[PDB]
């Protein structure tokens, strides 16, 4: 059941079509329903009307901050499954705050958040899959890549942000973990976003510049970053899992790379894949 959503943020039109320019987002109605998506960030503003009751922020590893008072996590949750700005429109969102509101998190608090989401995901109703979003990063830490790797090993499609350093992702975490689906950011004229990290360790590219999404205070905001490209991927996967069935956590990153539009991007250096997300739309 393919429907279409007219006047959709360019990023959604870019993923349901092989050629750029479309403002219509075409997708199957199931829209990642029966699937669960964990947003590991500054938290998610559940009350927001764009989530249609499908978001609940359930855990925090930050002292006395049990709410997204930053904006990052809610912006990312909107791209994953908000009514107007999200990919997987029937998905269920769960927020785990691992970054305080000034936008900072200890690696320890982050590793704990990843495990919490894995352990918690099994107490939730996600018959068609559990996906995860980590639009965060810092210097390379094996401890983090390992906690990240473990999520993958438990069957959770974890996608993480390449980074906004215009550098090779190999030097950051969760970015450098071979096992997670690392995401680079894309421009609407099909160029790698000037800030997007790159390298062999990045597994896919998706809309990352000028992305409109949900924001704290009941609004929307338009920001650019690899954290904007990542929820395009986490959402794309929930959608593919609710439509084609969950194939595995790494296999879902693999499936995404197979569907991806090839050699259409510019700004992509040698050693870096030239893959742009595509949702498999028959009439795409």
């Amino acid at each position: 059941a393919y429907t279409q959503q007219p006047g959709a943020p360019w990023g959604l039109g870019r993923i349901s079509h092989r050629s750029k320019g479309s403002t219509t987002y075409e997708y199957d109605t199931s829209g990642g329903s029966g699937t669960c998506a964990y947003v590991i960030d500054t938290g998610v503003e559940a009350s927001h009307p764009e989530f249609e009751g499908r978001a609940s922020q359930i855990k925090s590893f930050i002292s006395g901050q049990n709410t997204d008072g930053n904006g990052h996590g809610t912006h990312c949750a909107g791209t994953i499954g908000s009514k107007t700005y999200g990919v997987a429109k029937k998905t269920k969102i769960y927020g785990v705050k691992v970054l305080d509101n000034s936008g900072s998190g200890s690696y320890s608090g982050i590793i704990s958040g990843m495990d919490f989401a894995v352990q918690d995901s099994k107490s939730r109703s996600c018959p068609k899959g559990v996906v995860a979003n980590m639009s965060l990063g810092g210097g390379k830490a094996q401890s983090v890549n390992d906690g990240a790797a473990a999520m993958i090993r438990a069957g959770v499609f974890l996608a993480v942000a390449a980074g906004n350093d215009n550098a090779n992702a190999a030097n950051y975490s969760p970015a450098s973990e071979p096992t997670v689906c690392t995401v680079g950011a894309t421009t609407s004229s099909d160029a790698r976003s000037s800030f997007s990290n790159y390298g062999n360790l990045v597994d896919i590219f998706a809309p990352g510049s000028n992305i409109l999404s949900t924001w704290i205070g009941g609004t929307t905001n338009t920001i650019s970053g690899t954290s904007m490209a990542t929820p395009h991927i986490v959402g794309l996967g929930a959608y593919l899992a609710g439509l084609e069935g969950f194939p595995g956590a790494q296999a879902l990153c693999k499936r995404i790379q197979t569907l991806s539009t090839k050699n259409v991007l510019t700004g992509i250096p040698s050693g870096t894949v030239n893959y742009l997300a595509f949702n498999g739309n028959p009439s795409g």
């Binding site: 690696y107 639009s135 980074g163």
Partner: peptide, 4 residues
């Protein structure tokens, strides 16, 4: 880490 910081959000990106």
């Amino acid at each position: 880490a910081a959000p990106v």
